[PDB]
Amino acid sequence: REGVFVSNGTHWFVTQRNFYEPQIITTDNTFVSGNCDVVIGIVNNTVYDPLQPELDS
């Protein structure tokens, strides 16, 4: 949504463009558009959905 994806080598984070604050990638800090196929250099990772452990109560 804002900022950029990065990896420390083993894990993927989203972070601000101008200051490294690694945030876990979630359905709140990211937006979807279409399926994988079209994007040159897309990568595979989990994106966490904050709602699911809450409704899992």
Binding site: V4, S33, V38, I40
Partner: protein
């Protein structure tokens, strides 16, 4: 200078005109060809007339 991939710089630059980043990635081949072709038209214009 902080390195960034050019397809990621252009997605920041799309986001800076209120066009959502996915509009670049979903059209990256097309946007690249339009840039390359427009640079071709600059060569043709500058080569054709002073």
């Amino acid at each position: 200078a902080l390195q960034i991939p050019f397809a990621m710089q252009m997605a920041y630059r799309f986001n800076g005109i209120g066009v959502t980043q996915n509009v670049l990635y979903e059209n990256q081949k097309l946007i690249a060809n339009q840039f390359n072709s427009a640079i071709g038209k600059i060569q043709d214009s500058l080569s054709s007339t002073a």
